[PDB]
Write a protein that holds these residues in place. Structure first.
Motif, short mmCIF file in Angstrom:
data_model
loop_
_atom_site.label_atom_id
_atom_site.label_comp_id
_atom_site.label_asym_id
_atom_site.label_seq_id
_atom_site.Cartn_x
_atom_site.Cartn_y
_atom_site.Cartn_z
N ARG A 98 -39.94 3.81 -36.97
CA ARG A 98 -40.01 3.77 -35.53
C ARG A 98 -39.51 5.07 -34.93
O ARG A 98 -40.19 5.69 -34.12
N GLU A 99 -38.30 5.45 -35.31
CA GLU A 99 -37.69 6.71 -34.85
C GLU A 99 -38.58 7.92 -35.14
O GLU A 99 -38.86 8.73 -34.25
N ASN A 100 -39.07 8.03 -36.37
CA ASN A 100 -39.91 9.17 -36.74
C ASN A 100 -41.16 9.21 -35.93
O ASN A 100 -41.59 10.29 -35.50
N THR A 125 -34.80 -1.68 -42.56
CA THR A 125 -34.34 -0.31 -42.23
C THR A 125 -35.45 0.75 -42.39
O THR A 125 -35.43 1.81 -41.72
N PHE A 126 -36.38 0.48 -43.29
CA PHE A 126 -37.59 1.28 -43.34
C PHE A 126 -38.34 1.27 -42.01
O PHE A 126 -38.75 2.31 -41.54
N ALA A 127 -38.55 0.09 -41.42
CA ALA A 127 -39.18 -0.02 -40.09
C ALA A 127 -38.40 0.70 -38.99
O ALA A 127 -39.02 1.35 -38.12
N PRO A 154 -48.84 8.24 -43.55
CA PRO A 154 -50.04 8.57 -42.73
C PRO A 154 -49.82 9.61 -41.59
O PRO A 154 -50.72 10.43 -41.30
N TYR A 155 -48.66 9.61 -40.92
CA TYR A 155 -48.48 10.55 -39.83
C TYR A 155 -48.38 12.00 -40.35
O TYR A 155 -48.67 12.92 -39.61
N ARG A 183 -34.78 13.43 -41.85
CA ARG A 183 -35.30 12.18 -41.34
C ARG A 183 -36.31 11.54 -42.25
O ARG A 183 -36.82 10.49 -41.89
N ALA A 184 -36.61 12.16 -43.40
CA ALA A 184 -37.59 11.61 -44.34
C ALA A 184 -37.26 10.24 -44.90
O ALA A 184 -36.13 9.92 -45.22
#
Ligand SMILES: [Ca+2]
Ligand code: NA
Lengths: 424, 426
Positions: B150-152, B144-146, B106-107, B132-133
């Protein structure tokens, strides 16, 4: 064979020992082409990072393809050393009009990120469609206008996000435009010239400059480089079709290394990891002189990974292997080959995708009795020790392609030649 | 049909070359069809527009691969799957999606929206090269997806709110949306690279299906008026995880006139609805008869004469093996047809499309004029049955291009085709 090209790539994560071999093949090529990467190869000693290695042979054209990211400062430093050593360079160095530039702010972006050589940021601007390319240097007004827009964003990121220092517009503009007059006579339509070279029956060597397991798609993402560097990247990065990429020579070290971070299933030794201090790995590093050319930092070492090689062969379409640094194994009591992995209790015979999975791999090894002979300088397969021949026979089987060459030393004749890359 | 031989089908121009009938025609001879680049911005029309799922899906039994070089919107995927399942096809058991395919989140869509004031594709490729994808495989470790999301979001929300004047995208809602796709995606996730290797090793034939016009290629097109990735034929190698030697025959789909959508120089341009200085009735007629209206907005594409100097460039950067001509019948009504065979730029001759927006913008076309045939060419299935004046036009295109015309598609049906050489036969 008239009109035939070779791509030379490293099949692992770099430092495979491409130098001797590129020079060896350059004797049959009329053009040598860089298609990816930046300034990331050695009677005066000169080190080349950007200029194709063919420049060492008189009358060989050298091409910097559109797919390269170019620092003009690094370029002119190399040209200068070359000229000081007596070589004629500029009339036979051809630089794509569409090569992406590395600017001062890319280097600052790397430094600001680290604090918390500009290659990643340049490829980032490229994909962002805001990159300044070589040809843009020749309209001062529109160069300044794009630069201005780029610095508005990157200075926002530098100062507001990374907490660092702004990069000056006018200083950056003056530095860049100060290269225009010198660059102009070498700027070229490389794609067109390469089509003409082959249409005239001449042969090209596409010179890889980063290990293919660092490829942004197929490597242990995110511990990969900021572009594609598999052998098929030479098509887009040089402006030629995939059918021009006739034979792919896969340069393969007889054991594995990595530099920096990123998982490494067959790893034995990492000076910075207390849990990986295997003395066989320390031996590989010392006997193999696995220390950075500039930094002197030791590389990470491990046994050859044939399951990783097999992935490499598939993703690059490797035609045959050239093995290097066999001699580093001479006098080991035994040698191991990683032939697959256990991951989450399942057998896997190809290097997985992505850092997370590859870090979960436990290597599955086959063991081989070592040989004691020195293998330095041997130039026929039959003269190799039986136990060296058995190890390399097994490497071919697991990899799925033949060993076409074994480089046994720095001189042109310290080479076992099984098939000539430039003969159809 | 030569066992293990593959064909790569690309548009030679700036897209919309009319690949559909030919991709269906080639799929009859292929056991797998592979998308290797781009996102949900292909377009294959059915009587419904498929933009993501490879076109092999229309033929029962054919394996369809979404290669690693794709940027994938789960919502877009599951929308297409649902339209196809409601029409009674079986899709999921033969759709294979690379573990390494880059996700559109979404972002990415919010970043495109803020910039406008496509569809998240560019921002997804920007996260890829930025290392970073999040990729398809990443959905299957929720923790680890979360962490990476978060970082992105820290960075993309800073850019959205403080630079582009857009709204922050909420972490938890985005986390929930993406993980909600995992169970449905799971059965389809594969090692596409390995599977393609195996298919060729078993002697099966593959079709690598181009999504965007190759002149939109980020290195070779009119930069910056290009797509956010490489889409020349060569990019099928990296994008699907195969070597360049598997790309045996490159079929160049080439429209009998030219179009562009959106901004960028266009030397042979006749008609641009938004440009008052480009209102040639001929180009208006090309757009109407050619039905050149965007599949989403319905707005007319920009139209112009066939540019053979552009084709020549495209032949070279793709390694086009042979041309497939399309939409010749759009010229059937014309008194005369013109061919751009090169340019004048800075008072000097250019025979190939220059690199980058500035130089292409300075090109004036050099035209050769051909008498029109004023006769239908719909359904003609032999070279010799083409009107003399159509054969003359195409012969000259072939000459300037430097490669043969191996096919002319004269209609929407399989047998409305002149076949000069078969792409799947050595
Ligand atoms: Ca399945
Ligand atoms: Na020159």
């Amino acid at each position: 064979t008239p009109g035939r090209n070779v791509v030379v790539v490293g099949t692992q994560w770099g430092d495979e020992g491409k130098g001797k071999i590129v020079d060896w093949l350059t004797d049959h090529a009329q053009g040598v082409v860089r298609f990816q990467g930046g300034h990331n190869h050695t009677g005066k000693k000169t080190i080349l990072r950007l200029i194709p290695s063919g420049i060492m042979r008189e009358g060989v054209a050298c091409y910097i393809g559109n797919g390269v990211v170019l620092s003009p400062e690094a370029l002119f430093k190399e040209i200068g050393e070359l000229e000081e050593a007596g070589l004629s360079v500029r009339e036979r160095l051809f630089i794509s009009e569409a090569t992406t530039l590395i600017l001062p702010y890319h280097i600052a972006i790397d430094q600001a990120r680290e604090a918390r050589r500009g290659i990643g940021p340049a490829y980032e601007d490229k994909v962002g469609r805001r990159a300044l390319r070589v040809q843009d240097l020749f309209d001062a007004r529109t160069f300044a206008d794009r630069l201005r827009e780029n610095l508005d964003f990157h200075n926002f990121v530098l100062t507001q996000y990374l907490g660092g220092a702004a990069v000056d517009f006018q200083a950056t503009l003056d530095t860049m435009l100060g290269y225009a007059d010198r660059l102009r006579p070498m700027v070229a339509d490389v794609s067109r010239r390469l089509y003409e070279e082959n249409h005239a029956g001449r042969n090209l060597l596409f010179e890889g400059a980063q290990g293919t397991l660092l490829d942004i798609d197929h490597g242990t993402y995110p511990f990969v480089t900021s572009s594609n560097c598999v052998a098929g990247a030479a098509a887009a990065g040089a402006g030629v079709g995939p059918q021009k990429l006739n034979y792919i020579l896969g340069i393969t070290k007889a054991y594995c290394t990595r530099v920096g971070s990123g998982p490494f299933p067959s790893e034995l030794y990492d000076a910075d990891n207390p849990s990986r201090q295997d003395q066989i790995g320390i031996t590989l590093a010392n006997v193999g002189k696995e220390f950075g050319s500039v930094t002197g930092r030791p590389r990470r070492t491990g046994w050859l990974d044939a399951a990783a090689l097999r992935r490499s062969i598939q993703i690059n379409g490797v035609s045959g292997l050239c093995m290097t640094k066999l001699d580093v194994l001479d006098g080991l009591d035994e040698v191991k080959l990683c032939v697959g992995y256990k991951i989450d209790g399942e057998d896997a015979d190809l290097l997985p995708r992505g850092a997370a999975e590859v870090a979960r791999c436990e290597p599955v090894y086959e063991t081989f009795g070592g040989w004691k002979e020195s293998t330095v300088g041997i130039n026929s397969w039959d003269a190799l020790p039986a136990n060296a021949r058995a190890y390399l026979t097994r490497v071919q089987e697991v990899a799925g392609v033949p060993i076409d060459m074994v480089s046994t030393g720095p001189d042109r004749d310290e080479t076992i030649l099984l098939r000539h890359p430039f003969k159809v």
